Fold this sequence. Notes:
The structure is cut from a larger assembly and holds 2 copies of chain A.
Chain A: E1 2-6, E2 15-20, E3 25-30, E4 46-49, E5 53-62, E6 65-74, E7 89-94, E8 102-106
Antiparallel strand pairs in A: 1-2, 1-8, 2-3, 3-4, 5-6, 6-7
Amino acid sequence: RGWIFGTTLDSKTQSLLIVNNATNVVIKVCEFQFCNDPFLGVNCTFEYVSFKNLREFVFKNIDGYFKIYSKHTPINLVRDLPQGFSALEPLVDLPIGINITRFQTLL
Amino acid sequence: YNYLFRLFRKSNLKPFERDISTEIYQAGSTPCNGVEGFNCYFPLQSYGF
Ligand SMILES: *[C@@H]1O[C@H](CO)[C@@H](O)[C@H](O)[C@H]1NC(C)=O
């Protein structure tokens, strides 16, 4: 349901938070604070809004812009990544202006 | 004094990289350890127009 990206990731520097609220993608850049292992339980310098399956994503940051590509499919093999081919297509190209060194995934 | 610029950095910015960090900069022999001194200086300066 989300990802965090940054240099220190939390506390003394800015970081990028992406969360799915189950109705919209919610995105923000801020001097965020969080635990060592956060959960999505029931300064905002940029702010934005918009096994049976495999979901695929690509994240990259270039010249202060952050690109996201994706693809979604049902799958036959229950174990892991099926041997086959299809291509991911662009979602967003966000002008976030930060540099990045670390990331983390949100359940 | 509402207008300011960064005097020194660890490395040069990438294109459109933005840096608002306030951390004290080691300008010579003194390791900063989170506090100012000789050879350890505040990273911003103000124009005083
Ligand atoms: C965030 O707000 C604090 C004051 O609450 C300010 O000192 C700091 O410069 C701000 N940083 C950014 C990245 O806007």
